Amino acid sequence: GPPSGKTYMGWWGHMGGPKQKGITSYAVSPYAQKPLQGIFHNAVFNSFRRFKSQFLYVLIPAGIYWYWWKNGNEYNEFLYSKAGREELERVN
Amino acid sequence: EVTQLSNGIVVATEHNPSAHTASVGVVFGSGAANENPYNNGVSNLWKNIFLSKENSAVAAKEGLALSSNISRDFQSYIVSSLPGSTDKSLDFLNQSFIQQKANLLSSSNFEATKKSVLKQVQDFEENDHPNRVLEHLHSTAFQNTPLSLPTRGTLESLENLVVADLESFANNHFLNSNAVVVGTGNIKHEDLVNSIESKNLSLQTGTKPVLKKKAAFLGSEVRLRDDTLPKAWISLAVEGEPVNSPNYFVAKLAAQIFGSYNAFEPASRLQGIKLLDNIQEYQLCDNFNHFSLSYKDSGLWGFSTATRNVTMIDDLIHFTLKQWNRLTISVTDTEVERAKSLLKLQLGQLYESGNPVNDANLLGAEVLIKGSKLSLGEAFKKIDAITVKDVKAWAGKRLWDQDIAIAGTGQIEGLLDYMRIRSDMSMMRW
């Protein structure tokens, strides 16, 4: 067949990573162990852990654009209100 | 003929007038399964103490040869000699191994033996791949149970031993109720019993420790990957039959059906084994073999293989397991007929070889479980009585949709995950 280019992945046998030595793996057949073994204590304690870490990365970025839209919505409500047409004519 | 007397210690003897040598030995019913992970390797150290330079020198001065064998279920100490001097072997065995052990457990001798055994185990663990793969297969199949402890002992545990561990093990396990005195070759049973009776030859009181947990099989795998090696070595097995099972010979015959294969020998490429039809085209493997090993509590039935084709491992495993699948549904009569004679020749050479040490080990290991030794003739009739229905009945029970144990080392990156192999134990077309 025709030759091909140079990539960053191989296949089973020549995957292309570094040579490894001195690392051992153990596993057990799933017919011999019980799944669902720790679903509780993971739905409570594990989820709370992850939440407490990544929640100020989403809240403050959502805490800025909520007060920015609200002070524009409650400002647009006064500009088109009967008490805020005089400010409307100076911005229209 | 095999003659066994329970007077004194259990004395077994198999007489062969043709032989020009005679062996006398002691076989103990304890093995590497009787020790724990903290004193693992005490049996190997005892063996190498019996085989030490001073003991072997004193033995060889009289004209005697010493053999020692360590296994899961027994320990063998054999003295071989010429037929006229069979009484001298008993005297050496009494004087050295049994009566006194202070000389063999001196400080310098113990340190030298410990340093030699450590060197041997260190060399084994790095430069002997097909056998250490089988050891890891045992260690992962019977984990947390007595049968999984390696017979040589681990490197980390062998350092912690002192002479106190050795003498404790000798006190706990070297007992009259645990021992069989075996005689093989050109000796007579009556003469052997008379020679024992003249001396005392009492070992100890009895009551060896009883294990609290019986060996159990767990489906599992261990992968020791090393990319600086040229091949990949793989051993795969399922649970088999123990000694004294009704399906022992059926197991050995079903193993003999697939046999062994070497790619470089011209003759073994023409064998009636149908598996080769799938292997030969792309050179999937260099060699494989099939085994049916039996112990006191459980067994292993499977195969072991080595290959340089690191990109086609899964094809090899797939074709082998599809050949195993054929046993349950569509085994043919000609296969069984060939297997009978191949097994008979296979068993024939094993039990009828010239060397009496193998006979001594086999007789001692046999009488410690059965209580008697099966004859060669009665073995053949059970082999001849095997039919297709028996093979199908055994295979539908022992290997159809059953858990497996795997152990591999080398360039095993091509070896797929556990489940993908586990699904190959059924056809799904039947």
Q: How far apart are CA B407 and CA B403, in angstroms?
A: 14
- The identity of residue B234, as a single letter, is I
What radius of gyration do chain A's Cα atoms show?
30
State the DSSP code for B246: T
Cβ–Cβ under 8 Å, residues B200 and B191: no
Instruction: Name B288's bridge partners.
Output: B261, B305
Biggest CA-to-CA distance, chain A: 81
Q: Which of A21, A28, A32 sits opposite B226 (nearest CB)?
A: A21
CA distances for B389 relative to B301, B327, B392, B395, angstroms: 19, 11, 5, 10
Q: Judge whether A21 is closer than 8 Å to chain B, CB to CB.
A: yes
Q: CB-based contacts of B92: which residues, under 8 Å, 6+ apart?
A: B58, B59, B62, B64, B79
CA–CA min distance A35, chain B (Å): 15
Q: Which H or E element spans position B269?
A: none
Q: How far apart are CA B120 and CA B129, in angstroms?
A: 14
Domain boundaries, chain B: 1-201, 207-430
Q: What resolution in angstroms, rounded to 1 decimal? A: 2.6
Token pair recorded at residue B256: 């003999």
Token pair recorded at residue B425: 């134990």
- Whether A29 and B227 lie within 8 Å, measured CB to CB: no
Chain A residue closest in CA terms to B143? A28
Q: The sheet that has B2-5: what strands, in order across it?
A: B2-5, B10-15, B179-185, B22-28, B75-81, B65-70
To test the contact with chain A by mutation, choose from B126, B223, B406 the residue with the greatest count of A C-beta atoms within 10 A, namely B223
Return the SS3 of B76. Answer: strand
Q: Judge whether A49 is closer than 8 Å to chain B, CB to CB.
A: no
Token pair recorded at residue A21: 């030595």
Token pair recorded at residue B136: 């890891």
Phi, psi at residue B337, to the nearest 5°? -65, -45
Fold identical between B1-201 and B207-430?
yes
Cβ–Cβ under 8 Å, residues B23 and B183: yes
Q: The sheet that has B287-294: what strands, in order across it?
A: A21-28, B220-226, B405-410, B232-239, B299-307, B287-294, B261-262
By C-alpha distance, which of B389, B275, B277 is closest to B333? B389
CA torsion angle for B71, B357, B349, B134 (degrees, to 10)? 20
| Ramachandran region, residue B207 (left: φ > 0; alpha: ψ -120 to 50; beta: rest) | left
Chain A residue closest in CA terms to B141? A28
Token pair recorded at residue B332: 């043919």
Q: Look at the domain B1-201 and name its fold.
A: Cytochrome Bc1 Complex; Chain A, domain 1 (3.30.830)
CA distances for B406 relative to A4, B139, B184, B194, angstroms: 36, 11, 39, 51
State the DSSP code for B423: G
How many CB atoms neighbour CB B325 within 10 A?
21
Pairing type for strands B2-5 and B287-294 reads: unpaired
Half-sphere exposure (Cβ direction) of B200: Cα atoms closer than 13 Å: 7
| Ramachandran region, residue B206 (left: φ > 0; alpha: ψ -120 to 50; beta: rest) | left
Q: How far apart are CA B343 and CA B379, in angstroms?
A: 11
Check if CATH label 3.10.450.710 holds for domain B207-430.
no
Q: How far apart are CA B292 and CA B343, in angstroms?
A: 12
Q: Which residues of B touch A23 (CB under 8 A)?
A: 225
Q: How far apart are CA B357 and CA B68, in angstroms?
A: 10
Residues in chain A: 92
Token pair recorded at residue B375: 């004859």
Q: How far apart are CA A84 and CA B339, in angstroms?
A: 103
Q: Which residues of A touch B226 (CB under 8 A)?
A: 21
Residue at token pair 């067994």: B299
Token pair recorded at residue B396: 């539908």
By C-alpha distance, which of B282, B288, B306, B304 is closest to B231? B306
Q: CB-based contacts of B228: which residues, under 8 Å, 6+ apart?
A: A19, A21
Tell me the DSSP string of B371-392. Answer: SS---HHHHHHHHHH--HHHHH
Breaks (C-N over 2.5 A) in chain B follow: none
Cβ–Cβ under 8 Å, residues B64 and B144: no
Q: How far apart are CA B389 and CA A15, in angstroms?
A: 47
Half-sphere exposure (Cβ direction) of B346: Cα atoms closer than 13 Å: 16
Chain A residue closest in CA terms to B404? A29
Phi, psi at residue B231, to the nearest 5°? -125, -175
To test the contact with chain A by mutation, choose from B145, B227, B415 the residue with the greatest count of A C-beta atoms within 10 A, namely B227
Q: Where are the beta strands (DSSP E) in B38-193?
A: 65-70, 75-81, 179-185
Q: CB-based contacts of A74: which residues, under 8 Å, 6+ apart?
A: none
Biggest CA-to-CA distance, chain B: 69
Cβ–Cβ under 8 Å, residues B221 and B418: yes
CA distances for B48 relative to A5, B7, B122, angstroms: 59, 31, 15
Q: CB-based contacts of B293: which residues, under 8 Å, 6+ apart?
A: B240, B299, B300, B301
- Whether A29 and B220 lie within 8 Å, measured CB to CB: yes
Number of domains in chain A: 1
Q: CB-based contacts of A75: which residues, under 8 Å, 6+ apart?
A: none
- The identity of residue B92, as a single letter, is F
Phi, psi at residue B219, to the nearest 5°? -70, 120
* Cα dihedral sign, B41-B43-B47-B50: positive
Residues in chain B: 430
Domain extent at residue A37: 1-92
Q: How far apart are CA A85 and CA A91, in angstroms?
A: 10
Tell me the DSSP string of B117-141. Answer: HHHHHHHHHHH-HHHHHHHHHHHHH
Q: How far apart are CA B27 and CA B175, in angstroms?
A: 11
Q: Judge whether A58 is closer than 8 Å to chain B, CB to CB.
A: no
* Helix %, strand %, coil % of chain B (to 5): 50, 20, 35
- The identity of residue B83, as a single letter, is P
CA torsion angle for A54, A60, A63, A68 (degrees, to 10)? -140
Q: Is B414 exposed, middle or buried (0-12, 13-18, 19+ CB in 10 A)?
A: buried
Q: Which of A13, A27, A28 sits opposite B311 (nearest CB)?
A: A13
Q: Judge whether A67 is closer than 8 Å to chain B, CB to CB.
A: no
- Whether B310 and A24 lie within 8 Å, measured CB to CB: no
Q: Which of B222, B228, B413 sits opposite A24 (nearest CB)?
A: B222
Q: What is the CATH number of the domain that holds A84?
A: 1.20.5.210
Cβ–Cβ under 8 Å, residues B75 and B31: yes
User: Which technique was the structure solved with, according to the deposited record?
Assistant: cryo-EM
